[model samples]
Target chain A: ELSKKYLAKVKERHELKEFNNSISAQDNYAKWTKNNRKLDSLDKEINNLKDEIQSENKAFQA
Target chain B: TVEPNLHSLITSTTHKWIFVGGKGGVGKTTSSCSIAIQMALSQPNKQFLLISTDPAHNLSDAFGEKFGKDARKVTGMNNLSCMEIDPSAALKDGIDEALSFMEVMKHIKRQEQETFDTVIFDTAPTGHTLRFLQLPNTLSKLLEKFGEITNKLKANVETIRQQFTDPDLTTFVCVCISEFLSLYETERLIQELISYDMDVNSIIVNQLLFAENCKRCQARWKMQKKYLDQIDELYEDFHVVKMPLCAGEIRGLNNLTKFSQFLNKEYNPITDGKVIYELE
Candidate 1:
């Protein structure tokens, strides 16, 4: 579940950024915060998964 | 009305500069030498100079006297002087204005106890001649843009252009043989010179087979005659002097003098058939 969720979020992140060649993060304050928060959340989870599985040494971050 | 000879050039007192040019091997050097000799001889008191800008300088060979960057007197004449210079040297290397030719021109144009009554340029072949002719104008423009580098040079270029554009001050004599390509290039040369606003009044159609003997001569003369007719129609007002294919090379002073007489007098095959027939 955790692995699938990480991939799903990672895939979803590109679509928002790609919309109308979008940088909503730069365009408006409301959209900027939401865009930044969404990107931050997706990246954070991706990083979390990366930490847990990295080098296959031992699972660490949730 | 057009006079059928180069006598007008000899008579004109105002023509300071005369250029003899055409397609290669069409008798430009001989024609030039002949004109220079005639001019120098006409008024024995006046000083006339001929300079060959052709890299293959034949002025030396024509007069049978040595000449170089310095102007030297031809052996057989007192009034006539000749010099040889490669104008290509001035334009050499990638810098637009250099030494050699410009210095030669400057030296010629300046008066240091003497000045030439007339200066005849035995220019190189057509392509190089055109490039050389453009030098004064091109240099003027070049200096015009680079304002700080030269203004005095621009002043002199103005004078050169002034001299060239005036018909009385400068005139170009075109030399060509009677052939398809020769006629074609002559027309092109005329157009080019006219476009530059230089006066062109004479065209010497060299190497005519005014036939006397060989069937080969007869055949070639027929072909030459056809082009001669075309050339007549082409430049009706021009003083077209039809020069014969000489049996002997117009080398040495004596031969050149005899040959040059034909410039004023049209070649008569019926009368001078014996002279133009065999080897001299």
Candidate 2:
């Protein structure tokens, strides 16, 4: 269960990176751009949740 | 009645100061030169001084002679001198009154010399010319209201006004072409001069067209006629002289002398005086 959850989290992080890269590559890319703004906020939320999940997973393991 | 010639017009008045001003590139410098040359040549006993107040001095260019800030004698002409003031320096320092007052001070100092019988000022464009005329009032008002700092700041405004208003000392000659915009500004300028009690009794309508046969010439002639008629009606009380367009540029003394012939003509006052071109 731990391994499975870790792999899923890694996959989610990679997907987000790919999405951000594509958004930035588009024309007129900036914090004001719709795609960039949306992705940035989502990436932040996802990273915070990942941190919480990682700490919880470690505690469960210990 | 004998037509009013420039010689007669100029000699008719006891005016010692002649200020020629109009729109830029309308030939104020040339007109100023011609008037000074005429007077200097006609009255050999009297000395004439021509001064240019324009930032971009071209009086020298008009004469094809080099001139400096100080009053220097024109090489070819006797009892005739010219000076070009570089007001741009004062303008850069943002002190307009300094340069303007300095010029008047120069005049006062020259007057003390008791040499110049007549002083002709070839002024800048309409805006600068107007400002120049108002400089005395501006400086005097400043001194009157805010000269508590020192006695040196005090400038006599009344004396300056007196110099301009004294009919024997000053007469303003408004030079302009007969184009719509030119005449419009000329009319407004005359009104302003009158309000200031400055003598603006004479106007030189320069670069008149009297073309025939060619269609383009006819069109221009018609337009000139319209403006000329308006000038006659508006400046009825003023001494108006019409100068026709010459075949070539009026640069040296030869062309200037030839040009003077057109300037001094006998006209029946203003009624049917001198017509540039009579159309069929």
Candidate 3:
């Protein structure tokens, strides 16, 4: 009873830690997908902004 | 990465901080414990710490004695102590912090965790060993400048360099079986360590058949030696020690002493004989 049997504890904790890591890895994968989608929308918005600036400059010249 | 021919490395050094690693079930823990006992007996004055950085602690069974997080004095071996490092626990505080930061940053945050005197990982399986090697490189990137996450990351990397400056101080030994795929994977693992600037000191080919008298047996032995020679020639820095398959299990101090003799560069069959074999 003096000894703390650590082997069982290690196996148990490693299982839980690995499970948590699996979950987090999936969550991160989802976040990356979401971030990529936002970046695509931002690209379109930037293109529209550039077109608006170009049109206003052409009207001023006219 | 290192050129072939590694005889100069073995007999020249003593008082080394050695690490024994390889594919699992390849006798890494056993080899490590044997070497630790050998070293302690060889130099009684110097301190020798045989740490199992693997999450799994088979050293207890290997020694037939109990071990824990704290280093326990090896029974009947003076000046030598053994500790079973909980790799998961070693990074406990740091792992939690880094994981939290990763969640916040939206990037997998890396943190440098270099602590301890000499860590010998009787590592997990092949895949886990690769992940362990990738840990430092991975952690250094995310935790480089973040005060919020592992503020000591910069210092930790520096400490690893300063403390482990000499090749004499640190030697990473990989143990491999005489089987074909084990040898192949072991050689690949050596290449990985060499690329990372860690000194690849020795590769012990454990549990080998030393004799091949019959024609078919000789052919098979020759077949295996071809790849072994290829590995021997490929890595200049790795000393290959071959231990013949013992009839009994390698436990107890007496048996361990006998096992340690295989690491002798002069006696081990592979290193000692060095007889060339022809491929049919």
Give lDDT tens digits, candidate 3, residues B115-225. 223334454443344342344455665456465665645667545443343577666778888677787788787777766566766877766555652676576677667
Off by over 4 Å in 2: A1-62, B1-4, B90-99, B107-114, B130-132, B143-157, B266-280
User: CA lDDT of A26 in candidate 1?
Assistant: 23
True contacts kept of 3: 0.00
Instruction: List the pairs of residues colliding in candidate 3.
Output: B2-B236, B3-B236, B4-B236, B110-B139, B111-B139
What DockQ score does model 1 reach against the true complex? 0.01
Using DockQ, give the best candidate's number: 3
Report the TM-score of the second chain of model 3 against its true counterpart.
0.70
**A1-62: candidate 3 lDDT, tens digit per residue:** 11223344444544554433332222355754554555455555555555666677678786
Position B99, candidate 2: lDDT = 61
Which is superior by DockQ, 1 or 3?
Answer: 3
Please name the candidate that would achieve the greatest lDDT relative to the true structure.
1
Q: Write the per-residue lDDT of candidate 2 for residues B1-280, one digit (tens) a residue.
A: 3343576645544667888888745777788888888787777788888887665566777778887666787878877888876544333341343464465546546644747778888876633454645756666776776665666554365676788888768888889888988888888888888876788778888776665427877798889878888888786777788777654567776567556655665332243223322211
Error of 1 at B66 (Å): 1.0
Worst 10 residues of 3 chain A by lDDT: A1-10
Model 1's lDDT to the true fold? 0.75
Regions of candidate 3 where Cα sits further than 4 Å from its true position: A1-62, B1-16, B89-120, B129-144, B147-153, B162-166, B213-223, B268-280
